[PDB]
Design a protein that fits this description.
The complex is a heterotrimer of chains A (about 120), B (about 400) and C (about 110). Chain A has about 120 residues and is mainly beta. In chain A, about 0% of the residues lie in helices and about 50% in strands. In chain A, strands 2, 4, 5, 6, 9, 10 and 11 form a seven-stranded mixed sheet that branches. Chain A has a four-stranded antiparallel sheet with strand order 1-3-8-7, with no helix packed on it. Chain B is globular. Chain B has helices at about 15-20, 25-30, 35-40, 70-85, 110-125, 140-155, 170-175, 195-210, 235-240, 295-300, 305-315, 320, and strands at about 10, 45, 50, 60-65, 90, 130, 160-165, 185, 215-220, 250, 325-330, 335-340, 345-355, 360, 365-370, 380-385, 390, 395-400. In chain B, helix 5 (about 110-125) runs parallel beside helix 6 (about 140-155) and helix 9 packs parallel to helix 11 (about 305-315). In chain B, strands 8-7-6-5-2-1-10-9 form an eight-stranded parallel sheet, covered by helices on one side. Chain B folds into two domains: about 5-320, TIM Barrel (Alpha-Beta Barrel); about 325-400, Immunoglobulin-like, CATH 2.60.40.1180. Chain C has strands spanning about 5, 10, 20-25, 30, 35, 40-45, 50-55, 60, 70-75, 75-80, 90-95, 105, 110. Chain C is globular and about 40 Å long. Chain C starts with a strand and ends with a strand. Classes of the chains: A mainly beta (about 120), B alpha/beta (about 400), C mainly beta (about 110). The interface of A and C includes residues 34, 109 and 112 of A. Chain C: It holds the Pfam family V-set.
Chain lengths: ~120, ~400, ~110
């Protein structure tokens, strides 16, 4: 039971980056998948959420227009794509599994399973 | 008249989303019939609820209820409680409703036989009608709808068949209705919000003349919410129109409170959680305010739920709105205005301003029943020459 | 959007001593429906993702030692470590999930 992300990537200003996040060990379509990025030496910033059962998303306003989250249920993989890259986008990008409260059937947004992370560097 | 002529239909596509996690069974839905009575709806579109192993024709049984929804005896109990409260039950029989292709990709004859046999089975069980969606994916759908309509209507005249399409084209709709001329059909014909009042006027009048003013359904989709196509500023306007067009208005659960699936992060656009109070969405407490819930909107006369109840009450009791006699006169660029009448009963005038600017508009003076916006004298006569509409305002007026 | 402020930004504490990190939120994260505080605490070591320590402001995730404890309510919360140990050198974040967008604290560093 783990989440494994794609390798580190280096990009030029104005390009796009697509990070993958493969799930293993659990029912993929039952847990929401969030994305959190961390600039070097900085804090954590939540980007958005995708629900693997249906594909509905919800992005933070800061990233509305540049972020796109998709899913492939056959491969159990979540993709996050960021366009119009600038210097502020150099960060480690994590995919994180949303907690599921078995008792109440609710999904409060805190993260029990994290991915390795993916370093994206922008010139 | 026919029961589905006497008011609005109410689609509950997901039982667990409509009621709450785990309570999504037929027995639990019995406890919501009082609320659905307060909406004055005449029929529920329920399901599908049958056993459907996804994309597997042999392991799909339209005659057996998925245990996660209850038993056959739970369904019988639900039918009697609804009958005692004058609410009818429509069963959705779309076969592969858990897969991507609703009608499978193989064995068209076997799938059609499953539906045909399910019609006869559930008619004997006491259901009042059926709905089949995604008709565009069904080969020779016009022929199958004719066979299914004959069986449904040959069992009893008080039984209904509802077909659903994603299509918005008029020829593709007219060919589906050809061999039927009694099928209630729902489509994306009015789905585009960007259409002006002049265009909405053209859509309605052109459809009624191509169909010979036959009884039809009025809705924005075959299953989706009004908020899937309309912004909040147009919700009240469209609810006034759908409740005052000649035909049966069809809604989905949550339309009465303006339920917006995008407002709840992560929720499926097709089956969002129904917001009864502040405990309905405990995942993200800040996402739901009181004005978004049934409990909060029930205390507000200006709420969308209060308008839904007022329009539904008028649609099910006024004889001019129960029978389909309708004429829309030219009255402006962004205006849609029409009269509704039947013999000598009370007549109703509907004036709809789809634009963002005030636009100017049979007796000289008529009594205003309600407006989609506050600040007017309801129960005090207005006049139809200095009629002035605010942006996105709709008016309903009475005169004998 | 709810702002999370941690205090202090850096904390030096000897081994086997009480370590106290505070977290303040610009808005109450107490849900009056279930009387729960929608707050979580994470631990992050260099080169590694954050690790969930505490949720519901005071419920500890299975596997986290007993010395870690979370307290507080409403708008004020505290992460406390009874006796600091060597493997606890990390950056500690609080996170609210009462509303969207999800926001974190700036982080507190914990050294010997």
């Amino acid at each position: 039971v783990q989440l494994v992300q794609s390798g580190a990537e280096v990009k030029k200003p104005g390009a796009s980056v697509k990070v993958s996040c493969k799930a293993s060990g659990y029912t993929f379509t039952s847990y929401y998948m969030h994305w959190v990025r961390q600039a070097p030496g900085q804090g954590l910033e939540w980007m958005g959420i995708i629900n693997p059962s249906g594909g509905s998303t919800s992005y933070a306003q800061k990233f509305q227009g540049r972020v796109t989250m998709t899913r492939d249920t056959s491969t159990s993989t979540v993709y996050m794509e960021l366009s119009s890259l600038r210097s502020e986008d150099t960060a480690v990008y994590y995919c994180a599994r949303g907690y599921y409260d078995i008792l109440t059937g609710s999904r409060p947004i805190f993260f029990d399973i994290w991915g390795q992370g993916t370093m994206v560097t922008v010139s | 008249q026919k029961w589905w002529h006497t008011g609005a239909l109410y689609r509950i596509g997901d039982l667990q989303a409509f009621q709450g996690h785990g309570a999504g069974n037929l027995a639990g839905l019995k406890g919501r019939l009082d609320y659905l009575s307060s909406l004055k709806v005449k029929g529920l579109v329920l399901g599908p609820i049958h056993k459907n192993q996804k994309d597997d024709v042999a392991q799909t049984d339209l005659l057996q209820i998925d245990p996660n929804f209850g038993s056959k005896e739970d369904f019988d109990s639900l039918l009697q409680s609804a009958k005692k409260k004058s609410i009818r039950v429509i069963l959705d029989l779309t076969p592969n409703y858990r897969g991507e292709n609703s009608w499978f990709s193989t064995q068209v004859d076997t799938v059609a036989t499953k539906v045909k046999d399910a019609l006869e089975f559930w008619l004997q069980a006491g259901v009042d009608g059926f709905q089949v969606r995604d008709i565009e994916n069904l080969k020779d759908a016009s022929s199958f709808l004719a066979e299914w309509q004959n069986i449904t209507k040959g069992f009893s005249e008080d039984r209904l068949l509802i077909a659903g399409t994603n299509s918005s084209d008029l020829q593709q709709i007219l060919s589906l209705l050809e061999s039927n001329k009694d099928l209630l059909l729902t489509s994306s014909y009015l789905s585009d919000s960007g259409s002006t009042g002049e265009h909405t006027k053209s859509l309605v009048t052109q459809y009624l003349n191509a169909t010979g003013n036959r009884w039809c359904s009025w809705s924005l989709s075959q299953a989706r919410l009004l908020t899937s196509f309309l912004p909040a500023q147009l919700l009240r306007l469209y609810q006034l129109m759908l409740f005052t067009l000649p035909g049966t208005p069809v809604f989905s659960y949550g339309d009465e409170i303006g339920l917006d699936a995008a407002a709840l992060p992560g929720q499926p656009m097709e089956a969002p959680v129904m917001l009864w109070d502040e405990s309905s969405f405990p995942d993200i407490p800040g996402a739901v305010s009181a004005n978004m819930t049934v409990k909060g909107q029930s205390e507000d006369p200006g709420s969308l739920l209060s308008l839904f109840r007022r329009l539904s009450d008028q649609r099910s009791k006024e004889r001019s709105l129960l029978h389909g006699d309708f004429h829309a006169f030219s009255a402006g660029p962004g205006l849609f205005s029409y009269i509704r009448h039947w013999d000598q009963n009370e007549r109703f005038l509907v004036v709809l301003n789809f634009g963002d600017v005030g636009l100017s508009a049979l007796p000289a003076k008529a009594d205003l029943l309600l407006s989609t916006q506050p600040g007017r004298e309801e129960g005090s006569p207005l006049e139809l020459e200095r009629l002035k509409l605010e942006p996105h305002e709709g008016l309903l007026l009475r005169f004998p | 959007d709810i702002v999370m402020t941690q205090s202090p930004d850096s904390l030096a504490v000897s081994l086997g001593e009480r370590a106290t990190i505070n977290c303040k939120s610009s808005q109450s994260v107490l849900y009056s429906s279930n009387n729960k505080n929608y707050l979580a605490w994470y631990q992050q070591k260099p080169g590694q993702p954050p690790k969930l320590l505490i949720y519901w402001a005071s419920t500890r995730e299975s596997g986290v030692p007993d010395r870690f404890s979370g307290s507080g309510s409403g708008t004020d919360f505290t992460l406390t470590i009874s006796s600091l140990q060597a493997e606890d050198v990390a950056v500690y974040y609080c996170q609210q999930y009462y509303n969207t967008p999800i926001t974190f604290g700036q982080g507190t560093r914990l050294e010997i």
